[model samples]
Target: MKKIFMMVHELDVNKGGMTSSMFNRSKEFYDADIPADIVTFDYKGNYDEIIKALKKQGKMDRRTKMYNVFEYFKQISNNKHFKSNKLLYKHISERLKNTIEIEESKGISRYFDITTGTYIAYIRKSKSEKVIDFFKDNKRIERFSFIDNKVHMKETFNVDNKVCYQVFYDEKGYPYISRNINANNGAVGKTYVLVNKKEFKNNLALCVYYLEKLIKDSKDSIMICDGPGSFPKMFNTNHKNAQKYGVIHVNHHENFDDTGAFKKSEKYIIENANKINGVIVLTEAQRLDILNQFDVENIFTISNFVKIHNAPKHFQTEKIVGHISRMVPTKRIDLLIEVAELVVKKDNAVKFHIYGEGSVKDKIAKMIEDKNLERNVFLKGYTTTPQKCLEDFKLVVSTSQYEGQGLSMIEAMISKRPVVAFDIKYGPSDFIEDNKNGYLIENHNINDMADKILQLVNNDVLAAEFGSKARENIIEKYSTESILEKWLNLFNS
Candidate 1:
């Protein structure tokens, strides 16, 4: 069996979007009668972990017996199966499980064959506490750290709408990659570096460090890189035997037409695309864009996926529009307000709800008051779970100029809410069907947008039809099963 590794470098579950989808899909595919290993990496020096450990221990003094009853039980409960699978649960506070087996309510095998440490009489599932100190002489696992210290980190890419993919892989298993770490640039409860650039030695050092351990233990494996940005070069330097493939998640721009000065910053990534064994794109348009720009042969389009929950059959008649995004300048929430002011004037019943936190929040707030939109538009500070905020709205609106994939739009569509957005490049244009699923207004047209919003609100029959079409579109094109099939096919190839 050819091994496929699903890597999660920074393991935190609550972080949404790509991270959640990555972990969920990996587990589902592996369990859906597909044979593969699911491994997750946990940063040992995580500030949360440290503080958690300290609080549980209740260390009155540093030298005291910190590992006590309450602390021990909490650690045991984190994984829950540790007590029953002592052999499989060697690592005290961290682990990687076969998510497939876990879903089926079965025991995951003891797969920790390689480790950084060794024990003379390590007990297996039998849980024998007979450790002879006299026979304490067994050690055979190499040790290395991706970070310099207990918590040093690599740097991250500073560009907007870009996420980094860094991880360790053998020929076989990869770990669960977290998006929270990716977005915050690896910022946990501590200071950490982000490895997003061509710091070749650092990249190779980390690649080798983790892959070596994984390869040594894993039998007949294949490691997949999350994206083309990092792995191919690192693979060449570190493990010649391990096969490498790059999985693309968003719109790849070799260079955009001189629409604005922003396109120039992505030159570094475009120049380096050829070095990857293969590049995975999300749409046919993206694939074509990459091929046309770079003249590269290795590229495949895999559409992104999200969970689709059925939304309510009817929406409130009150004209409610919602936009979810960072209130940053480029996101252009100001433009949305400008459009709303004109729309709300025509109909006093119309209201807008803006969700999310960003740099421009204060400025947007001031502008909203200045425009006397205090009663008409509400700024709902960052919701912990954003999808929930889209539940009641009649239509989901966005002023974002572009996106790799309009995640929230897809989410809104799946929730059976119609979308209203500027017909911007890449994502919204690809997803939104004009006048059918939702209106794709001309980009940057304030008056035209406001007019469209009013038109949709006034026409109940048209809005309902659009919402129905949107739900159908999202399920057919972007559901989890559909996207996972693409990934499986790519992996098999």
Candidate 2:
């Protein structure tokens, strides 16, 4: 009865590492004979296909159980009798292409009023028929999305670009669900299921209502909130026998508001953590911190795990430093550019290649241009193959201001490449040793970071030794099997 259900906000074509870790954990659990399923809340209308691709790509197990809240209701809507004669995309085109003069430009097909030729509505089309965003006076007013070549959902927006109203259709394109959306917070008002004349307080209430059905009413049943947006709601939900756990992603000491209050999600979890059965932090340091601050003994530190690569690591001849992370402000990648300037002065042969597309990357890229480190520093965009990307580098680097037992550094370790990260490990209890497992450089010191990188680059034997030791430590200390054993240990206890 060791069944677990993970709650996530949504899944997209390109997801974050946080989402990937859940997938990895779930897949490994499936192989280990645990039934771990995924439950997603928000629907992007195209999640059906997105999930199909994800499962087909072997990122998740082909037989893994997964459910989406709206998709669940949408399935139940199949046997339901819908009444909305929602206009079909083909039907709309039949009137426009046949009788109306339509000038299409930039994927938007513009149609004018026949009698007065007044500017009517224009629609934008994608691969799957069209989303059909209707406009008035060149302003987007409503968006019509088709599910089975007919309108499945319609969303109306006000002048302020707020979702004013939303409706969901059934199999035959009949409006079965409708709700008014608040412009202030974008929260749904009283949702009406017109098909059965059922009323829910809001869309959230309806989602939560379905979420309860997904939980198993058994003592060994586990429902964990890996995604914080879904955590507060999961915390408020009542379960009979299933124990609920809140998995805090980032450490608490970092994500505080300017007023000294914790950020909404993290803050909410901390205050109400005792209400749940268990609290899972990524590190023992975080667990201890929370224990000292709050009255909770259920907290557990489950160190983040990485998939150990059995492939022999091919050490590169040229000394290249790789950084694979999101281009976000918190990552402090710009500081790495400063380190690059210092590194090149001593050894011009060493190259720094930063991977993954991010928000602050433009700023970091321009900094590289300004520092004239173009020859030394290279902004490598998002890569599909991170392991292969590291094959070209001698070692890896990270300068994030705040991160928790990150899998990226451990991934470098698994790749048999030593990581020279700042003080970003999960405190002193983490897998990283100051110089053994990998060099945990001082935080925010660019010169010291450069000096460490140079020391490793200048010494091949020392670099290979650190790389081998990192891999050995990872296999013995932080492998996926290690975490798996820890999880089963908890279950047995």
Candidate 3:
């Protein structure tokens, strides 16, 4: 049995396109009777939250089980009795206020406190030594001391000046099972794993340790980084037996030029390009661009493939323009609003629906209200089913500065809706042939995008022809079966 591990930071469905792609690809693997699992770092919290997020979308596939590395270690540690008392947070806060002078302390790190609504696990860094102060519900003077990122000793105090627990750290500063001491200051036979859930100081070292074990245990398994941004930062890509690959989901360079000026996280991938087994991109154009800059040989192009469905009817009564994407600055949703203003002026009945949510939801909402486009341009927060909701629109639109594969646009094509988008570096050009399936305007040209959309709205016959061709092109070229075979061949070879 071949096992494929897809590593990512989180699996929140509403987060972005990567989660959707992961879900689709994993489903494809399962339907083909292949073994695959979604792996994540559990950097923030438990896997229950990710489960809850996917559940909101309706019945998720049984194969869509996401594994968390930290959560797995916590279970294996099997220390069930170690429950954090709420009063411990308050005790730590009060002790820090009275004992440590924040004005004098050079570098102090604070964390979240549940009780007094303050913080916990405060650390002070000095020239030679590092003091990590901890407090219990009863005692307020337990301290873990470290120097050069290596813990020297951790002393837990009791009321009678006796040691409650003594923790020793490895050279890497990861804690071992704590030695419990009695009232006589003697060591107890039983040891406890001291997991500090407050600050997660030890998780980074622990994460590396657990990932190494997974790599050692699996035989001929391929480990893939799903998004290739934050997840690679924590993952150990140099595992011996495992074939490590990174799937790029966005533009590599910060700007349009190929001067080796790239995003910091992307720069790591490029700098270590030779070490990576294969760097997978969505478009051939991006693949060429990457080969031009790096000495890597295994750059592969695999666009997001969709499950084809029966083409929708070519007629529409409502002249509605649709957009489904995260409302972030890079998506250029503000430009969509500016284009909507121009579009609405050409025809009052033409309505625009902006779907999806992000940090800029309120900002985009304010723009809609300030421009008095509430009736025409509506901020439809988020939809569990964008592919279904978009069926009612006359045309789909996009103004993204760049796209990995334009999954939503592909979804639109599958739904038989024509797209009008900016002529970006990679995605739109691959799918949208000018005046055929959709219009691809010059990059950042708001007026041209609006003009093309207006032309589609005015001519229903042309719009229907474009929409029919969009669905046909996607069905003919990017079918689920073809993409699945491509992946299977790559893995089996």
Candidate 4:
């Protein structure tokens, strides 16, 4: 049977809107009986555990293998030498060349220098070098070998003879290997294998090899690339047979650059646009911007799919304001605090709650403390479902400089709360209809934003009217059925 695969850097539901959107698409596929799965590169969290958690949340129904590239290589590549101990790597590589019995796998000509750690570069005679498969702790020299195109098998660090390393292949045609961590205690750890490459060497070669194998193995499948730029472009370049597509998850240019020129890394994707079959953006404005910059024919504007929810029976009466997103510099969260200070001066009863976490959390917290707005402004930590918390607020606000699609705003609208956002490049202006649904302040206009917030808080009739319109706008434009049909059409085509 044919299938669809979404290639993502990670499948962390709590990461952000991209992961959330992917899961929502997967759930839609499950309901439609279309065999679909997510292929993640860096899933450090427990895979089975998250799946079970998602099931409970009613977010995921059908369970497919969450192909994790990092887990595949954890056991085989886990070592002190490869990570940061470069001094030991040089000695080990030199020792292995002299002592290990290197064989050329009976006339296989393709040979390469395989490096596992910082300085250990082993010359492998063949791809299936069994010399590296055994687990031993002795000072014996063993050459690291390739398990697949990207993953290399190497001698284990455990000293006990009782410890055994096993290799198993799953139904999806990839290696699933595990090894005993403690030979004495009989403890074991499961590890999966995956790939990388260089300026056409070491790490880069391995990554390209993995992508080639993945594409070749999954021939005739529809592959969707979430997010943009060189990373996705890298896979698309090596892929064959699979219908490759990309999703634009962020603004393509700088905030001030209205010329629509692509950023340096983003330019790579456009230069290599022929490699991908199509490109999907969240809004029509972005699509037009991309078209003007590049002559790509398959650019599409598919609004993100948001499951519709009924407006709350009665709005929360508190003058609580909400903002849900990572507390990062790009979000301009500091500006939110400045606006909050103004809102408090107008009406001391008003309170602001900032949700989500990042490197800038401490900085933003300091700003609030410095301004002496602690009583009215609170820094709420990370929330898995920000929408669940949105209903407790009278309205939601965004002080971001820009957005890919402003997912948090959409969630607030869907939850029946009006929004007060900066009229940024892509997201806010797309959904927020000025005075109708939500207030769209001019970019970085702190006083205007504060005024808008005060307008909603002081007038119950205006907030309710705007809140009702916000819900109706999202339901009409971003309904699940309409969005799903667009994805289905793309996959089918």
lDDT of 4 by residue, 32-101 (tens): 7666677665423245567666667766545654555445444333431233434434544445442433
- Per residue, candidate 1 scores C-alpha lDDT tens digits across 1-493 of 5555544343342344455455444455565554443333343324345435533543111221111111222243334332232331244223332211112123212223234333322212213111111111343121112222121121233334232433221111112121223445543222112222222233334444545545433323555555333443334435554545555554444333455332332333344456644565556776777777675677767766566766776664667888887776657887888999999899999889888887999999999999999999999887766657766688888887756667778888877788888876567877899988998988888888888888888787877788889989987777677677776665565
- Displacement of residue 12 (Cα, Å) in model 4 is 3.9
Task: Give candidate 2 regions above 4 Å deviation.
Answer: 82-99, 133-141, 160-162, 255-261, 425-429, 491-493
Per-candidate clashes come to 22, 0, 0, 13
CA deviation > 4 Å runs, candidate 1: 6-9, 34-204, 216-220, 227-237, 250-274
**What lDDT does the true structure give each of the candidates?**
0.56, 0.76, 0.71, 0.66
- Tell me each candidate's TM-score: 0.64, 0.91, 0.72, 0.70
Stretches of candidate 3 above 4 Å error?
43-46, 49-60, 79-204, 216-219, 229-238, 255-260, 309-315, 369-374
Off by over 4 Å in 4: 42-46, 50-60, 69-220, 227-240, 254-265
Model 2 TM: 0.91
TM-score of candidate 3 versus the correct structure, residues matched by position: 0.72
**What would the C-alpha RMSD of candidate 4 be, to one decimal place?**
12.4
Give the alpha carbon lDDT tens digit for every residue of 379-480 in model 3: 887787666776688899888886776877877887878988887867888888888998988988888888898899888888788988988888887878
Best by TM-score: 2
Q: Give the number of colliding residue pairs in candidate 2.
A: 0
Q: How many backbone clashes does candidate 4 have?
A: 13
Could you give the C-alpha RMSD of every candidate to the true structure, in order shown? 15.7, 2.9, 11.0, 12.4
Candidates, ranked, TM-score: 2, 3, 4, 1
User: Model 3 lDDT vs. the true structure?
Assistant: 0.71
